[PDB]
Every structure is written in structure tokens, then in C-alpha cells.
Structure 1
């Protein structure tokens, strides 16, 4: 009988896995990537999902939808919805106090619900799983952040149903992360787990209790607008001033010059997780000038120091809400691609007095991993 899949439906990035033959397989897409962007684009002739939609973003900003997870199951008048709208190139209209994203598709003006947009991202993850398994997939477990209310969970389940799946259950992402490491398999007694999630655009800290495989959410804290993208912003803003100091020219009012500097900065930051120095080499960046420069891991840590240090406040709030002491936490799990930053790891380990972090499972894949495991139960 057909296998059930585990879907990690992320704000910026999505991942799908399957549990088969006592093993977990994180499924790669038609481009060989195990992570797909949570993007949907509407063109003159077609609808694009994932990387195909992400790669054409600058040539179609208004009809490339992303961040649907920020709107899913919320009301238009919601303050969250109202402040986020100011930063999106796509139009968000009001229908009965329900948000709808409005775009131009095949000559026509069309409006879709956030659950309709996420259903498109879920249709892609499903199809990725079917090409691998060689048969049509029906059953799925889709994850949600632990702080999500019942409207947001119903709306997420609705996306699965619209995508053609039978949503067996909706579980929490920190729950899926603990299941991946087998912390639910320790038996009778109380274990306290802290999951530290630092992704592309979101930051969540959760405290769970596991007693005989039964999970209890005790505290949730964080910042829905803190992630990897902010670290790129500090690097970008650092190299704009450096180009000024050297060439006496402002690159910020050229869209392509800023887009190209961003790409370079993302990769650099990435090199610095395993290296003490990274180099930036952009040909004809602005005014015909080649920008051949370098940054150290130390100068990078300096530019982001306030951001890395602020990740300890929601750790303190979560402990104080859960009414626990740091010595009371039995396990520490690292989830999210930004947790690869050595300074992020040093800060969390030092706070927890040199204790060991659970990080061997790819931080981008750990949530889908556990969700596939849970889907097989």
C-alpha cells in the first residue's frame, strides 16, 4: 500500500520526505534540490511553482506570490496582515474580512486565498514525491509552527485537501524535530526539550515535555521577522558603504547592482560558517567598476552582533514561561539553515553551560524528516 509523506510547509522554503525500509528519504526535485522555495508566479502564459517562480521574480514582482504562511487563516483587519502588506510587491485585497492576493494571470485579474496559494506549493511537493515513489500519493502529514491557532491549522489542512491530499494529521514543527532525533522513544518519565529554529526569514524557540511518547507544548517565543535574510542585509549595507569609501558612488539606486550584491553576500555569509575569510568578486558591479573585496568571520560577527545576541532573549522568555531553569532542559535541538552560523551555536551552548546540541540531521530537512516518520506510524 502507498506510503504517506511528511511535508515541511515553510514561510520561505518547503521540503518533503518519505519513510521506507527503515530509512528516511528527503526527496529531491526535477532540478536535484531537496528544498523548494515557497513561491508561486503567474505569467502571461502559465503558473510557475518553486525555483521556476523564484528565478523570474525581478522580471515580474507584482505577480510572484510568496509569504502566504504569513496570511494563512488570518483576518484582513489583523494588525499582522496590515503591517506586512506595506512590504509586498503584490496586491492584497479584502473579501469579507478575508485576505486575498490579487495578480494578473493570462490577461485576467485573479484573486486567490492564502490557502489556495499554499495548495499550489503543496501540489509541487506531492508531485516531487510521486516521481520518486513511482505511484500517486494520497496521505500526508503537514507541519505548522507550535504558536498557530485553530483557524491557521484549519486553513493549512484546507491547502492539503485543495492539493488533493488526505491530511492524516497536522503536527507542530518542534514536535517533528524531536521525533527526527528519537526523543519521543526514551520511555516513562519527564524529558524537557528546547528546539531552536533559525530559518531564512523566521525565528522560533519552543519548549516541549515528553512523557511516554506524549508531547506537551509548555512555551513558545521568538521573532517572525528575524532570520537569515537580515544577516545578508547587514553584509549588503556594509559593502554599499565600502563601494562609497573606495569609488565615491552609491549603488543602492540601481536595482540590478543591489540584486547582484545580495547574491554574492548570501554565498559569502555561507562560506563563513566553515571559513574564517570569504571573498567577493563581482565584475562591472556599478559604473563599470569591478568589486573585488573580502570579509572575515570576525567582521561578519561584529556587523550582526546585536542580531545573534537577541536570539538569547526568546530562550530566556520561553524558560520563564515554561517555569523551568536551564539545567532542567534535557535536550537541545538545532533546526533552520541559519543555525549553521558558528557564533549562533557558541551563544546557545554557552547559555546552556557547554552542553551538547543535537545537530547531525541537516537543519533544513529535520522537520520534514520527523513528519515522514510520524506519517508512517
Structure 2
């Protein structure tokens, strides 16, 4: 009579990392890729012989900086003249060119100079998320919900849909990232009455706070605030500067001019930063860091917390501005939701919990996965085609 329908997927198309989920058997499954990672870098690399996407792209970035593209989400649906674009270009090693006041990334690929629109790069990341899902389900996937930040305008939302269409996906809906995080916790299923939800999203390079109102499953964005210059990378920079100084004191050598040694130091710092979220101390062990000198040292959580103290406290400024803009008091917030891997930092949790006078934080769904989780829940609801009984 009627063949079984393929499951629909939920994709969190992130600036630095993307995540894919599927709702099946009354639960969401966040799907790991072929290297066993539950999140995949939003990176695309170009060589003379291949196009690499995800972990394979990010793992070769050090020797191929001009032809490895990342951060396409910062360019999508924007004009080349936009001041945001002009400032970001100074930080990127790849070339961004002007094509009719629209940015394009220009790279060397298969023996030719090729330029791509930001939606084409994003479609390559979406093609990888679709393949990760089809590897798990064992059949082709057609339908998806893709998420965007709440501040995205119509042009930015249409370019995201265009990326999905290029990737061979039927885009069921473009939904806001804070709304997807709320749906992941079933905050739209609590029945009659109004609820105020604050979403605290601390990413790799940016911080976003959103205040939503939920009434009979209807969502309304009340306020948005944030800091474009606050994220996980700034906490990594503080550790890097700390260990460069430590090497200088101990061995009387300045390493800051050997790119390999700085990169090896930064890679080790980022991992030490992650260990410190679960442990009270972490070891740093690098062999032949500079001039055949082995760098074996440690960092306590208390010292790391001191190094980043001003940065962690500054997350409360957008919280207070969002509360003023929404015309709400902190006692009027019913639910606090954590989004992004940097929210695992115990001190960040402590500062926010203390700000909301001891209230519990919803952090049971991995913060790097909550957006895709909610998008997968929505995707399964959107493909239902039930006919009413008599």
C-alpha cells in the first residue's frame, strides 16, 4: 500500500563545527562520522588531486592555509562591502574576492584557480553531513531541517536554503538555533501558560544570548545580545601566551617566531583546556618543542581560571543587556539552557548560576549537540502526514 518513509535529519550548520541527528524510536541519535566524532569541522580543503571535507580538511590546514576554507557562515548572504566582512578578511589566510559586491573565496583546485560563493562552500559541508547520516541509516536521506542564528536576516536565510538545495537536500524549514536548543529540552511541550527561556551560547569565536517566550508551543524571540569577540579561541590564546612566557623563564628562549612550535603549543593548550573541565589539573607534554628542548609542564584549573577571569565575567554583560531589552528581571526567567562546548567550563557555569541565585542549568544534552538534537526533533514532526479518524 504505502512504503516506509526514510527518516528526516536535523543539521546544526555551525561556524566552526557542524552536527547531525535523527529522531527514531522516540529518541534522538546524534550521528558520529567515520572517524568517530559526534561533531565535524565546517572546513573544506582543496588540492591538486582532491577536495577534502571535515576532519580530513582540518587535519591538513597547517601546510595548506591558502586553500583550506573555514568560517563560510560569516560570509553567507552578506555584501563584500559590509564592514563585518572587511574586518574578518584580515584574519583569514584564504583569499576573499569581490564579484558584483558579493564575496567569493578563491583557491587553487585541481590545477586551476577557482572561486566559490559562500553557499557553495556550505553545500559541501551539508553534503558531508548527509553522507554521515546515510552511513548510519543505510539508505539515501532527502529531508532536513537546518538551523541558523536568530539574528540572520532574509538574505542570509535564503542563502542557507540555497546551500541545502545545491547539496541535494529538501529543506523542510530553516529554524533559529536558540529555538532548536529549547525544543531539544521539550520546553514547547509544557502546555498552557507563558514561559521565559534564556539560551546562553558560548562558541569557538562568538557569544550569543537569546531570550525566548513560549506560549502553547509558539516561540517569540524577545531579545538577542552577545559579543562577537568572545569565545573558546580567546581562552586558548591566554594559555598560549602563558606557556610562551613560562618557556622564556625556564629555558631563556623565545619560541613565538617558530610557527610549528606555536601551533604545537596551541594544539596542546586547547586539549589541556578540555581536560581542565573534568580535572583539577592537566599535564602539557611536548617533545622537542624548540631547539630540541622537551616542554613537559602542568597547569591547574585555578591558574587557568585566573588567566581567563576577565573573559568569563564579561559573559554576564550581554545577559544583563538582553534582560533589559526583553524588559524582564532575572527572577522572571523560568529556564536557563547551555549551548556550545565552552559552556562545559565549571567557572562559566558557576558565574551564571550565581548570577541567577543558585538556579539549575539545563546541560544534560551535550551543549555542542543540543541545536542538532532540537533540529532532528522538529524534522520528525514536519514529515508526519496523519489523516484524522472519524
Q: Please report the TM-score for the alignment, with normalisation by the length of structure 1.
A: 0.99
Q: Output the CA distance in 2 between the equivalents of 1:52 and 1:283.
A: 24
Q: Output the CA distance in 2 between the equivalents of 1:271 and 1:58.
A: 24
- Aligned to 2:308, the other structure's residue is in SS state helix
Shift of 1:281: 1.0
- Aligned to 2:256, the other structure's residue is in SS state helix
- Aligned to 1:57, the other structure's residue is in SS state coil
Q: 1:300: which partner in 2?
A: 304
Q: Output the CA distance in 2 between the equivalents of 1:73 and 1:85.
A: 16
- Aligned to 2:91, the other structure's residue is in SS state coil
Shift of 1:20: 0.7
1:272-309 CA distances to partner (integer Å, 9 max, x unpaired)?
11111111111111011111111111111111011000
- Aligned to 1:298, the other structure's residue is in SS state helix
The counterpart of 2:63, out of the listed 54, 59, 74, is 59
Shift of 1:224: 2.6
Q: 2:162: which partner in 1?
A: 158
Q: Output the CA distance in 2 between the equivalents of 1:225 and 1:110.
A: 31
1:330-374 CA distances to partner (integer Å, 9 max, x unpaired)?
000011100000000000000000001000111111110010000
Shift of 1:23: 1.2
Q: Please report the TM-score for the alignment, with normalisation by the length of structure 2.
A: 0.96
CA RMSD of aligned residues (A): 0.7
Shift of 1:263: 1.2
1:53-82 CA distances to partner (integer Å, 9 max, x unpaired)?
000101110000000000000000000000
1:218-265 CA distances to partner (integer Å, 9 max, x unpaired)?
001112332111111100010001111111111110011011101110
1:35-68 CA distances to partner (integer Å, 9 max, x unpaired)?
1000000001010000000001011100000000
Structure 1 unpaired stretches of 5+: none
The farther-off stretch of 198-207 and 213-222 is 198-207
1:3-28 CA distances to partner (integer Å, 9 max, x unpaired)?
11000000000000000111111011
Q: Output the CA distance in 2 between the equivalents of 1:159 and 1:136.
A: 18
1:153-197 CA distances to partner (integer Å, 9 max, x unpaired)?
111111001101010100000000000001100111110000001
Shift of 1:143: 0.2
- Aligned to 2:62, the other structure's residue is in SS state helix
1:103-134 CA distances to partner (integer Å, 9 max, x unpaired)?
00011000000000000000000011111111
Is 1:144 aligned to residue 148 of structure 2? yes
- Aligned to 1:256, the other structure's residue is in SS state helix
The counterpart of 2:367, out of the listed 352, 363, 367, is 363
Is 1:37 aligned to residue 46 of structure 2? no
Q: Output the CA distance in 2 between the equivalents of 1:295 and 1:23.
A: 39
The farther-off stretch of 364-373 and 196-205 is 196-205
The counterpart of 1:286, out of the listed 283, 286, 290, is 290
The farther-off stretch of 219-228 and 355-364 is 219-228
- Aligned to 1:252, the other structure's residue is in SS state coil
Q: Output the CA distance in 2 between the equivalents of 1:16 and 1:374.
A: 13
- Aligned to 1:216, the other structure's residue is in SS state strand
The farther-off stretch of 73-82 and 225-234 is 225-234
Q: Output the CA distance in 1 between the equivalents of 2:239 and 2:76.
A: 31
- Aligned to 2:119, the other structure's residue is in SS state helix
Q: Output the CA distance in 1 between the equivalents of 2:230 and 2:48.
A: 34
Q: 2:323: which partner in 1?
A: 319
Runs of 4 or more off by more than 4 Å in structure 1? none
